[PDB]
Write a protein that binds this ligand. Structure first.
Ligand SMILES: C[C@@H](c1ccccc1)n1cc(-c2cc(F)cc(F)c2)c(=O)[nH]c1=O
Length: 258
């Protein structure tokens, strides 16, 4: 391991002197996989995700440790223990992921609340793009809801039905292909967690998109908001709106919505 990477990652490292990991306490009955309840000691409730590649993990830890924004889930720290797997320590999200929350028949957020959630994902994505951070897996399942219903962009994971055309063809990813995925997320929000392209199988998604065909406008989705989704799925990556434009446009729709 490069000794400078080791020096630079020490500020991200957390150990047993402050972190109690409750390995017999899984979060959300197994929804997120190997993610356990944790306590950071002055008590803080956290989520402890259990996982050459070590180099890239330390690098990501450094990058994610800097994230500070109300709509981006924070990296509280990482564990690099002599015995066992690497751990990722994140803040505990009271209402789990966004897809599950809105799919649940016992939750009924209004049309305006769903637009509000989308506005929050846009703001988190505007911040991530400002740091040149390409997500590669932006979906409702990867957005978390805290105790005050604040949406926080996160990653708990090919999601071919969320990828942009150029990513399906060339395998390359950019902030512009994240904008495409954001459009599908807005669709998930307006459909209340319905799966995108139910009649189009994974292997034929590219041909469906090349034919100029897109996700249909969900009922109760405002026409200006559907226009925004269509801009997110522009076949030319350079013509898609930025997350700053998506914030401006969605705030306008949100504040005027009747
Ligand atoms: C901070 C947050 C996140 C990620 C992306 C966008 C926004 C927020 N996050 C980070 C990791 C993570 C942390 C690492 F230190 C190394 C690594 F490989 C992953 C994770 O597993 N889950 C998760 O939600």
């Amino acid at each position: 391991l490069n000794p400078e990477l080791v020096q630079a990652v020490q500020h991200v490292v957390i150990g047993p002197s402050s972190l109690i990991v409750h390995f017999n306490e899984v979060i959300g009955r197994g929804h997120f996989g190997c993610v356990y309840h944790g306590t950071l000691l002055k008590k803080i409730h956290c989520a402890v995700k259990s996982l050459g590649e070590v180099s890239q993990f330390l690098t990501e830890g450094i990058i994610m440790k800097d994230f500070s924004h109300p709509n981006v889930l924070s990296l509280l720290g990482i564990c690099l223990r002599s015995e066992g797997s690497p751990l990722v320590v994140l803040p505990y999200m009271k209402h789990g992921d966004l897809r599950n929350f809105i799919r649940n028949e016992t939750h009924n957020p209004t049309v305006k609340d769903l637009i509000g959630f989308g506005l929050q994902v846009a703001k988190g994505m505007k911040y991530l793009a400002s740091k040149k951070f390409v997500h590669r897996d932006l979906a409702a399942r990867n957005c978390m809801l805290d105790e005050k219903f604040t949406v926080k962009v996160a990653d708990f994971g090919l999601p071919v039905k969320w990828m942009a055309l150029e990513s399906l063809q060339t395998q390359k990813f950019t902030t512009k292909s994240d904008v495409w995925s954001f459009g599908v997320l807005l669709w998930e929000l307006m459909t209340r967690g319905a799966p995108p392209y139910p009649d189009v199988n994974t292997f034929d998604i590219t041909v469906y998109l090349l034919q100029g065909r897109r996700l249909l406008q969900p009922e109760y989705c405002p026409d200006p908001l559907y226009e925004v989704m269509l801009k997110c799925w522009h076949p030319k990556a350079e013509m898609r709106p930025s997350f700053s434009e998506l914030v401006s446009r969605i705030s306008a729709i949100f504040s005027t919505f009747i």
